[PDB]
Each structure stands twice: as structure tokens, then as C-alpha cells.
Amino acid sequence: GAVFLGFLGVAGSTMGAASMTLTVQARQLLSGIQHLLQLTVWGIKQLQTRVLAIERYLKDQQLLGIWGCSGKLICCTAVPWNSSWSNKSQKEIWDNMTWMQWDKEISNYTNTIYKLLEDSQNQQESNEKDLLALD
Amino acid sequence: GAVFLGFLGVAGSTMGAASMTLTVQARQLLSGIQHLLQLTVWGIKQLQTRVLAIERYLKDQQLLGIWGCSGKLICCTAVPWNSSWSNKSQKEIWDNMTWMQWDKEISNYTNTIYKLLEDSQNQQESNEKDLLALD
Amino acid sequence: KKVVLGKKGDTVELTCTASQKKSIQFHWKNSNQIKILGNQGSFLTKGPSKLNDRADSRRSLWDQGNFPLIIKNLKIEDSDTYICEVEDQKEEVQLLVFGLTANSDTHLLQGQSLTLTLESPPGSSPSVQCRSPRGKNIQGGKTLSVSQLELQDSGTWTCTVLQNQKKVEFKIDIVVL
Amino acid sequence: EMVNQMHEDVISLWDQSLKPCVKLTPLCVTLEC
Amino acid sequence: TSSSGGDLEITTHSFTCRGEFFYCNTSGLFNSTYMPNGTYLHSSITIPCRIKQIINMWQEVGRAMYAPPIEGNITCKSNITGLLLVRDGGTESNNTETNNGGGDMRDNWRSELYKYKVVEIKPLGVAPTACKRRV
Ligand SMILES: *[C@@H]1O[C@H](CO)[C@@H](O)[C@H](O)[C@H]1NC(C)=O
Ligand SMILES: *[C@@H]1O[C@H](CO)[C@@H](O)[C@H](O)[C@H]1NC(C)=O
Ligand SMILES: *[C@@H]1O[C@H](CO)[C@@H](O)[C@H](O)[C@H]1NC(C)=O
Numbered sequence: 088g089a090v091f092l093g094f095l096g097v098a099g100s101t102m103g104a105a106s107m108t109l110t111v112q113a114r115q116l117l118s119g120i121q122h123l124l125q126l127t128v129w130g131i132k133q134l135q136t137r138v139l140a141i142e143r144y145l146k147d148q149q150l151l152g153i154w155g156c157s158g159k160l161i162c163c164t165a166v167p168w169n170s171s172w173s174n175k176s177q178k179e180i181w182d183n184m185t186w187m188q189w190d191k192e193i194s195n196y197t198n199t200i201y202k203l204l205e206d207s208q209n210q211q212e213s214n215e216k217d218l219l220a221l222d
Numbered sequence: 223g224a225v226f227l228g229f230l231g232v233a234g235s236t237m238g239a240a241s242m243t244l245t246v247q248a249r250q251l252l253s254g255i256q257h258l259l260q261l262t263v264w265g266i267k268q269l270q271t272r273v274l275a276i277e278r279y280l281k282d283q284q285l286l287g288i289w290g291c292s293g294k295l296i297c298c299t300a301v302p303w304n305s306s307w308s309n310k311s312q313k314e315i316w317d318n319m320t321w322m323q324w325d326k327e328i329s330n331y332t333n334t335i336y337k338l339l340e341d342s343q344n345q346q347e348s349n350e351k352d353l354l355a356l357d
Numbered sequence: 358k359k360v361v362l363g364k365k366g367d368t369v370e371l372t373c374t375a376s377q378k379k380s381i382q383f384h385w386k387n388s389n390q391i392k393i394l395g396n397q398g399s400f401l402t403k404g405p406s407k408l409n410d411r412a413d414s415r416r417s418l419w420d421q422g423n424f425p426l427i428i429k430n431l432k433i434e435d436s437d438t439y440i441c442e443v444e445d446q447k448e449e450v451q452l453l454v455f456g457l458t459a460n461s462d463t464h465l466l467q468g469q470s471l472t473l474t475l476e477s478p479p480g481s482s483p484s485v486q487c488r489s490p491r492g493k494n495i496q497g498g499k500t501l502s503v504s505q506l507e508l509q510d511s512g513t514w515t516c517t518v519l520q521n522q523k524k525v526e527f528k529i530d531i532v533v534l
Numbered sequence: 535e536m537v538n539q540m541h542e543d544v545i546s547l548w549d550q551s552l553k554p555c556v557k558l559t560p561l562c563v564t565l566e567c
Numbered sequence: 568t569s570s571s572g573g574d575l576e577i578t579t580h581s582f583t584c585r586g587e588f589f590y591c592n593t594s595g596l597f598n599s600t601y602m603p604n605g606t607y608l609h610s611s612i613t614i615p616c617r618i619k620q621i622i623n624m625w626q627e628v629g630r631a632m633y634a635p636p637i638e639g640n641i642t643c644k645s646n647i648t649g650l651l652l653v654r655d656g657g658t659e660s661n662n663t664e665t666n667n668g669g670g671d672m673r674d675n676w677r678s679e680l681y682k683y684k685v686v687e688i689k690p691l692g693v694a695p696t697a698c699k700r701r702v
């Protein structure tokens with residue numbers, strides 16, 4: 088995906104391609120089985136990138152936290168979809184609109200989904216207490 | 223464990239030893255309660271290691287993801303064991319074959335277990351939908 | 358099996374194969390495994406044998422994985438199986454070298470006789486097919502002789518000996534006066 | 535093969551280390567005999 | 568009992584000083600027999616090993632041509648760690664035994680690395696328990 092990250096697919100490959108290259112990125116990195124006096128500064132600048140990679144990585148890989156699947160690579164949410172948002176089915180979805188040209192179709196619900204998602208997380212917290220109010 | 227990682231036991235100590243030093247690594251790091259003009263380059267080389275530590279750390283500490291226990295330090299899977307694989311019980315298991323000489327006994331099921339494990343993860347996904355097909 | 362032959366005065370070539378083509382460790386060792394010639398990494402261990410004075414090899418070829426072995430100025434005692442054990446197999450050449458001469462040394466006369474002697478190494482069952490400038494196909498074993506030796510017999514004689522599927526040519530020089 | 539690695543490190547070291555005036559090294563390119 | 572000879576570097580004590588080496592014959596220290604006594608004799612006294620210039624390479628087959636030496640006044644000391652030997656063996660022998668020589672570096676620096684065995688970590692480990700999930 089051109090960088091240490093974006094590592095769950097290749098551009099132009101439509102959705103299903105990237106979605107499945109998830110597991111093969113896993114399975115491919117699972118087993119593991121001249122230098123100038125001022126190369127210093129290149130190494131240096133080389134450093135940041137990797138850190139920042141992990142940093143952002145977490146930074147929302149973290150805040151998949153309030154989204155209920157931090158750390159991992161694959162959510163499934165619990166919200167009712169609004170056909171007003173995309174109105175498409177997996178067939179054309181995964182095989183077409185090579186994502187970069189996919190999400191622009193929904194460039195606006197970008198935060199409405201975060202809305203509904205954290206909302207259902209709080210929904211779960213509410214039902215956990217409802218269920219615990221007796222035992 | 224000789225490095226920032228491998229930090230859940232000591233070599234030669236058989237399994238039970240390392241398995242329990244897990245929790246005491248936790249409990250021991252919980253509370254927290256000359257320099258040459260070219261020391262630069264040693265610090266530099268010192269850097270990578272720590273990053274790469276976290277990097278690999280995650281990199282599959284991450285892909286404990288598809289294994290259903292990423293992030294953490296201790297899984298319990300959900301698969302039926304093949305006595306053909308080791309045919310041993312915790313008693314000798316944990317007290318003997320100081321792991322380095324333990325896993326070589328099963329140097330081949332290395333990926334069969336990943337097989338069955340991700341397989342049961344997908345098994346859970348399948349049962350979640352079966353169960354949700356009505357309500 | 359793959360033999361070689363010599364002429365008691367010649368050299369000979371003996372072959373060693375290698376698949377890595379890489380100059381890996383070979384050693385040349387005779388029947389009961391004395392060390393004769395050996396690649397020690399990038400070096401040749403002139404073994405402790407009868408051949409501490411003679412044997413050799415084209416040295417460049419090793420970085421190709423073809424390791425040779427020569428036996429210069431063969432005398433009938435250098436006649437023996439060898440072996441090359443490059444990586445996991447022990448290719449065996451077998452060298453059965455001889456030579457030959459005639460009885461007459463400098464002086465012959467017309468109507469006289471001459472005989473032959475072939476200095477075979479032990480264990481050989483050869484057959485000497487020998488020629489003449491006059492077409493005297495002396496058909497027989499070792500000791501080839503003829504009761505007729507004439508001025509027309511002048512000129513050397515292409516003598517030959519078959520030792521287990523090969524031969525090698527020979528002078529029998531004939532000079533009068 | 536750590537030993538081979540040290541080996542090749544050393545061979546790397548020796549040549550800018552040591553300067554052969556005129557090195558007569560051999561070569562052949564495959565042409566069967 | 569047998570230093571046949573050949574290329575100087577396998578037999579003679581060949582060692583690097585002034586960048587060059589000291590090449591003598593099989594006359595020194597190479598001789599003694601052992602039935603319950605040695606066979607030699609009895610400060611800096613003598614042994615005649617001299618220098619060449621046109622050397623062979625331990626590295627890759629093929630000659631080399633070095634420089635005329637320095638005027639003089641050189642010295643080299645040492646601390647022998649050990650020795651490099653193979654029986655001058657065979658099947659001509661009757662009850663005397665002889666050892667005889669080394670020129671392959673891959674052991675010349677392996678009387679120092681029998682210890683060092685490089686390994687990855689395989690910090691992902693498998694073991695049995697009684698762990699299985701909800702159905
Ligand atoms: C892209 O086009 C090629 C045509 O050569 C096709 O084989 C490939 O499947 C297309 N990409 C996707 C994701 O379908
Ligand atoms: C989304 O769908 C729900 C029920 O399907 C509906 O109540 C809500 O108004 C919809 N919102 C949008 C923006 O379509
Ligand atoms: C929207 O979804 C409805 C569902 O019945 C479908 O019939 C219709 O074709 C869709 N329209 C568009 C523009 O996606």
C-alpha cells in the first residue's frame with residue numbers, strides 16, 4: 088500500500104481484493120521463517136516515518152477503541168445502514184469503485200458513521216446496565 | 223528473555239516457569255514507584271532495535287488479531303487438539319522440555335495450528351450470523 | 358568403469374564433477390584412501406603419497422566446479438584407482454598405465470629378429486596388436502616376435518595394446534647402419 | 535552460517551585492507567570439453 | 568611424520584605480519600613421535616621462516632603480487648589458542664599414528680564460534696490447556 092501502512096491491499100484493486108489481502112499480509116509476515124559520515128541524517132529522517140507510522144497506527148488504531156475494535160484490523164459494526172448513503176450490494180461493491188473512488192461516493196457520511204458507531208457503543212453500555220440491574 | 227521482548231520467561235526454565243513469570247513481569251513493571259561526539263551513531267543504532275521491538279511486537283501481537291487475542295499476552299484457543307501432535311499432559315509439559323526444546327517436537331504443526339485457529343475464528347463469525355438470522 | 362590409460366612417459370587427466378560449480382572441498386585419494394590431491398577451501402593439499410612429487414591439477418577450473426588431477430611422467434606404479442569426493446559422492450577414475458620397448462637397441466641386420474616387451478601393471482589382460490611399415494600385423498599377446506627382419510622393415514612400428522576397452526599408439530623405431 | 539558471514543565480512547575487509555600490485559586472477563566461461 | 572608440501576600456505580606456518588607472511592619448510596617442531604616420550608631434543612634462539620612476495624589467496628583461487636618489503640626492524644608476538652590438524656591417515660599404517668595442516672578459514676574462525684548459534688525468536692508459542700469458546 089506504498090508504505091509500512093495501507094498494507095491491506097493494493098490501489099486499483101477493488102474492495103474484495105484488499106479485504107482479502109488482509110489475511111495474506113498476516114500469513115506472509117507470520118512465520119519469519121557505501122555509508123557516508125552524514126548518512127546519519129538520512130537514517131534520522133528515515134526514523135520518524137516508522138515511529139509516526141506506529142504512532143498514527145495506534146493513534147486511531149487506538150481510537151478504534153471507542154469504536155469497539157481497536158488494535159485489530161477488521162471491524163463489524165452494529166448499526167442500521169442508510170440506503171441513502173450508498174445503496175449498493177457486495178457484488179458490485181467489492182468488485183468495483185476501486186476504493187479511492189469508492190469513499191468519495193460517501194465523502195459526507197464520514198462522520199455520521201462515527202456518530203452512529205460510538206452511539207451504538209454507548210447503546211451497548213446502556214443495555215449492559217439494564218441487564219445488570221437485577222443480577 | 224535477553225531483550226526488551228521474550229519478556230515472559232527465562233530460557234531453560236521450562237514452560238510453567240515462563241508462563242507464570244508473565245504475571246510477575248506485569249506486576250514488576252506496573253507501579254513504577256563519557257559521551258562522545260559520535261555517540262550519536264550508537265544511540266542511532268540503539269534506536270532501531272526498540273522501534274523494531276514494538277514493530278514486530280505489534281506486527282504479530284497485531285496479527286494475534288485474526289487469532290482473536292491481539293494486543294494481549296495470553297490466548298486460549300477453541301480447537302480440538304490432535305494427540306498426534308504432542309500427546310503430553312500439563313504435568314510433564316510445563317515442567318519439562320524447556321520450551322526451546324519443546325516446540326521442535328512440533329516443528330511441523332507450526333502452521334496447522336494457525337490454520338485451525340483462524341478457522342475457528344471464522345467458525346465464530348458463521349455462528350454469530352446463524353444466531354442473528356432471527357433476531 | 359571409466360578408465361584412463363597412459364604411456365610410461367606421458368601425463369594423463371582425471372575428472373571431478375561438482376554441481377554447485379563453486380570450488381567446494383574436493384580431495385583426490387587412491388584405493389585405500391591416502392590423501393593425494395585436495396581442495397582445502399581455496400588450496401591444494403599435496404597429500405602424503407607416492408605422488409608427493411608428481412600429481413597436480415588445473416587450478417583455475419575449480420571456481421567452475423570441475424576439478425582435475427594429472428599424474429605427470431607416469432610410471433607403472435602410479436597405476437591405481439583414484440577417488441574424488443567433492444560433496445557427497447566419490448568419483449573413481451582408474452588409471453592402468455604402462456609402456457613398452459623392443460629388445461634391439463642400436464644395431465640390427467637384415468634377416469635377423471627382434472622382440473617386444475610391454476611393462477603392464479598388475480591385474481591387466483591386454484592384447485598387443487602391432488604394426489609395421491610393411492604391414493606386419495603381429496597378432497598376439499605380450500611377446501611379439503618375427504623371424505624376418507629386413508631393410509624394408511626400416512621405419513618405426515605403430516604398436517598398440519588393448520587394456521580393457523582402450524589402447525594407445527606406440528613407436529617401435531627401426532634404423533639400420 | 536554465521537561463520538560464513540564472518541568469513542565474507544573478512545574477505546570484504548582484506549582487499550581494501552591489502553593492496554595487490556598486480557593480481558593475476560583466472561577465469562573461464564562455459565564452453566564444454 | 569609427513570609434511571608432503573605443495574602450495575606453501577597449507578603446510579608452512581603462514582601468518583600475517585607486515586601484511587606478509589613467513590614461509591619455511593617442514594623442519595621445525597613438526598617431527599616428534601609419541602610413545603610415552605616426545606622426540607625433539609632436551610631466550611629467543613632460532614627458527615628459519617622467511618618472507619615471500621607472490622602469495623596465494625585464501626579467499627578466491629588465483630595468485631597475487633605484493634610489494635617489496637620494508638628495510639627491517641619488525642616484530643610480532645602472539646598467544647596461540649590452539650592448533651589445526653588431521654591424521655595423515657590411510658591404510659598402509661601399522662600401529663604408529665600421525666596427525667598432519669589447515670587452510671580453510673571457515674574453521675580457522677570456528678575455534679571461536681562453536682558457542683554462537685544465531686536464532687530468531689519464535690515468541691509465539693503453542694501449548695495445551697482446556698480452553699474453548701461459547702457456542
Ligand atoms: C483490472 O483489469 C484487468 C484486465 O487486464 C483484470 O484482469 C482485473 O481483474 C481488473 N481488476 C479487478 C480488481 O478486477
Ligand atoms: C437511516 O435508517 C433509519 C431506519 O432504517 C431511519 O430511521 C433514518 O431516518 C435513516 N437516516 C438516513 C439519513 O437515511
Ligand atoms: C436503492 O435501493 C432500492 C432498494 O429496493 C433499489 O431498488 C434501487 O434500485 C436503489 N437505487 C439506487 C439509485 O441505488
Ligand SMILES: *[C@@H]1O[C@H](CO)[C@@H](O)[C@H](O)[C@H]1NC(C)=O
Nearest residue numbers: 177178179180181182183184
Ligand atoms: C463492475 O462494473 C462493471 C462495469 O462498470 C460490470 O461489468 C461488473 O459486472 C461490475 N461488477 C460486478 C461484480 O457486477
Ligand SMILES: *[C@@H]1O[C@H](CO)[C@@H](O)[C@H](O)[C@H]1NC(C)=O
Nearest residue numbers: 171191192193194195196197
Ligand atoms: C455528500 O457529500 C458532498 C460532498 O461534496 C456534499 O456536497 C453533499 O451535499 C453531501 N450530501 C448531501 C445529501 O448533502
Ligand SMILES: *[C@@H]1O[C@H](CO)[C@@H](O)[C@H](O)[C@H]1NC(C)=O
Nearest residue numbers: 234235236237239317318320
Ligand atoms: C534446572 O536444573 C536446576 C538444577 O541445577 C534446577 O534447580 C531447576 O529447577 C531446573 N529447571 C527447572 C525449570 O526446573
Ligand SMILES: *[C@@H]1O[C@H](CO)[C@@H](O)[C@H](O)[C@H]1NC(C)=O
Nearest residue numbers: 301302303304305306307334
Ligand atoms: C485431529 O482430531 C480430529 C478429531 O479430534 C480428527 O478428526 C482429525 O483427523 C485429527 N487430525 C490429526 C492430524 O490428528
Ligand SMILES: *[C@@H]1O[C@H](CO)[C@@H](O)[C@H](O)[C@H]1NC(C)=O
Nearest residue numbers: 304305306307308309310311
Ligand atoms: C498417546 O495418548 C494415549 C492416550 O491414552 C496414551 O495412552 C499414550 O501413552 C500416548 N503416547 C505417547 C507416545 O504420548
Ligand SMILES: *[C@@H]1O[C@H](CO)[C@@H](O)[C@H](O)[C@H]1NC(C)=O
Nearest residue numbers: 312313314315316317318319
Ligand atoms: C521431567 O522429567 C524429569 C526426568 O525425566 C522428571 O524427574 C520430572 O518429574 C519430569 N517432570 C514432571 C512434572 O514429571
Ligand SMILES: *[C@@H]1O[C@H](CO)[C@@H](O)[C@H](O)[C@H]1NC(C)=O
Nearest residue numbers: 306326327328329330331332
Ligand atoms: C514433523 O516435523 C518434522 C521436522 O523435521 C518433519 O520431518 C516431519 O515430517 C513432520 N511430521 C510429519 C508426519 O510429516
